[PDB]
Amino acid sequence: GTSTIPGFNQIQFEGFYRFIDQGLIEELSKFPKIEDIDHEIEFQLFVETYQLVEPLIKERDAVYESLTYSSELYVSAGLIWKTNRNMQEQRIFIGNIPLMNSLGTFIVNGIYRVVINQILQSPGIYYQSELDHNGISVYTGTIISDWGGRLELEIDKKARIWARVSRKQKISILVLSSAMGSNLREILENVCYPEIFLSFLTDKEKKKIGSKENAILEFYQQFSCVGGDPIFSESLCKELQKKFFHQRCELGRIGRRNINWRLNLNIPQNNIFLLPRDILAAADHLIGMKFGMGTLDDMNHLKNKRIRSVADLLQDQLGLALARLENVVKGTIGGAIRHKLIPTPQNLVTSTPLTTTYESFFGLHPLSQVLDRTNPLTQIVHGRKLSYRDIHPSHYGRICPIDTSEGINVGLIGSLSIHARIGDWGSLESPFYELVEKSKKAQIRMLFLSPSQDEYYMIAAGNSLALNRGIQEEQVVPARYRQEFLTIAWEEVHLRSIFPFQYFSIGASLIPFIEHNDANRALMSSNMQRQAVPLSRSEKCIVGTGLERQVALDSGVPAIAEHEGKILYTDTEKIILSGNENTLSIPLIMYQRSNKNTCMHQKPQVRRGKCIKKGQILADGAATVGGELALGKNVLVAYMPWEGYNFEDAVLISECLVYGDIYTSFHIRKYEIQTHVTTQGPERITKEIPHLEGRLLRNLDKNGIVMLGSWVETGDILVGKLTPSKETCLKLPIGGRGRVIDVRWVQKKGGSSYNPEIIRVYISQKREIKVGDKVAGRHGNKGIISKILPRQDMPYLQDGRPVDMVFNPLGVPSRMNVGQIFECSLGLAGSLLDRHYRIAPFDERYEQEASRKLVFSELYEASKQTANPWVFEPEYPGKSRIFDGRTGDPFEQPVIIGKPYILKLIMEVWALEGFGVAHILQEMLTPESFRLLVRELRSLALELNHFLVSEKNFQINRKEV
Amino acid sequence: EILQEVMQGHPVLLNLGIQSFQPILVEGRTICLHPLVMAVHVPLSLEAQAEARLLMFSHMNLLSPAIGDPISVPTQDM
């Protein structure tokens, strides 16, 4: 990450390595030794001989059989029976630990899962000051533990300091301090304001403070709010310690560091627990804070936050799982003792505490998410998400300012920047280039800065292409310093931001000419690129940013050589590579369904006799050409209104996109069924289904499952099933026509007399582009196809070629996304010149109007080289007169034409009352709504009777409600 | 052929967020709306069909109730 863009999955990869390399020991060493009531039998774990066994199955097997890709944790355990003094040691099998793929994904019950990163408040001390109802400043200081425990302090109106443990519980400072062993004498001496502390000492409080034991009882009375006088006992402290001090006063290493630096204390970094002086120091600054000495904390600063990655969560689950196993053995140890049997260390340990703790974490934890496999981009960006609304200056280079969610979570789910990295205290770090003085070695000038260090460096993003009669060091550039912007000389600059993609996420970094787009359209563009369907034929963009190749490499979608050598054999199914007397066979994915019913398919990118290095590409996956992400197509486009068929975001297209198969995609839908044992018997699969026409059963085989390669339609039975008999067959739903490409059938090998039978049918649909489909560029220009015209009806160019799509030009000025205009012109030049362009964003740093110069010069070269003068018109560059296909007359004004990259994507009652349509409203409401209301009111001993009084004879009728 | 017959003269409600239109059968799979405008309701009773045709149609509601301004003024490309 110092001189290249890091691997996009690096954060997941390092985190899992830390969990295996160090995380296991920290939790396996917290497992208590288990001793019985009589202390006769003692069980212990020899942690130094812990082992991990490679999975017996392969990753593709764990998906085919819906199993879990996992490793076996083995430890040696000793069991001493003092009745016989025999120490028996065996290799105990604690359970399974799910393993992570190189792409940062887990396979749990066959489902690809990704653990996303959480951002949380870091432990430490934070000095706030909130205004009361009268506008009087009140200063508050809160201590946060490693568990999130909050020990709040405050200054009240009478200056009495209270330890607010909850909204209703208040504890005086002196009582809490004395319960921890601090006598009244030292507290006064070591605080800057002893006269303040003595001023609140009531006579009743002094007698209790005088002894440590009585202060503990006083603290318990206030903390528990229980009427009465408790009696000191060892059990009371144990209950008090877990409820309060185990949850709230265990700072940890990060909290101790933050407590020390914030409060200016020289306390060793090894002390992870709260000290009486730390509480006392918080009291001192709180007073000095009220009187103008210092600054208040900013809770939204990233230096006050910390990131919890897959290492933190997987280590918590192991710690939670080891607490269960201890009580599992405690229950089993008592049972063996009650039966006077010698228990084998094995029978004392069952695997479920470790296996079921992880299946339940992956299935239920909100940070464990099913991997989005719509396209290669969705796979790579899912693992870089950050879950918690405003942009903060500390975010720059760490959290993308654009990529956020749309709706109600906006600003609470963000993305990590491309060059970001997680540091040694859960902090996000970003790399900057250091400008060092003359006399220093300075081997590597690229350094990673945490958010705390960022404020105190002068960071410039300008360049040094400016000279006057003076000297270069005196030229001024915009820089960031202390969370603001200045203009300083170059000689005062400490650091330079030099990486082109430093400040943005992956999605924003795929938008060419992004600096010409309003920042709101760049957010909508990131979302649309995540909805792009892989096409049956793939094609590289003419114009890109250059990040497309990195996405292809990190997604895992292509096949990359794990070994150097030469290619000997390629076909549709495999590629054989041999190097250094070692031959490897690499299978190729074919027509495999993804999470969102998209089609994955690999095609070889190498031939026989071609030499390969390790890490080079072998095959192209879906939406990938030549090692580049390829989410769309380059098509001929004109920007003009066309008879209202492109009104607003509507898009008019040519029939050639349909019969050319330009935007045709494959969609594989999986239909499933299971057998269950009802009270009347087991469900059966058979072709012989009574009372059904033979036409529907024509696709079934002898066992009652649809044949391979059949052409099924809506209503056609896929699996014949009988429920003891009533028909419960797997019928194809509406809109599911297609071809059966794979049938799967297996019985789950369980311990019961009946093993459930599971059938899966995979049906492939080839979907061409249609009216109602949605398309989009990369600049937040999204459209819906409203009309498909024959090619002779389309507007056509001065070379006679009709255009493929017609976009509304009125969509650009309102949306302020000028970048699509640059891209379309440059795309046309590239196609005529047989060129592709990969342009890093913010090219204006070189010179004014850099994009205009690049686009116009390339347009002119395309016009000159191909003798196509309409391509570059000196009178109006980028635009040309085009012709109406219906009439042959030219359109009056010149029109921008180009070849952009286009992707294909995956009160009412009041209004009726305002119209006075009483009978329509009655129909749309219909009574069961009111009859059910009466019964619910009856449950509360209320009766609601509806009476009609006749206007004729005044007789009252009780309606039947 | 029957569907075309019974649809004629039978308005439907589309949800000025909710209005009444006379439906016509179109080719394709999408609902087609005129440029100056998903739940579809079919009035069943003759009382509801009268209200839809005579009160909720898009030509007796040309003025907005707020100040009396026209509702369907041409915009954008028009």
């Binding site: 196809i785 619910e936 | 709306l33 440029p35």
Partner: peptide, 28 residues
Amino acid sequence: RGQPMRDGHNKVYKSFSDVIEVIVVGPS
């Protein structure tokens, strides 16, 4: 009353008081 009754899965019981309280353009 204060802290409401909760079940074993840390869920507060609901009483009766809680119970009662695509389009495409056509220009032609």
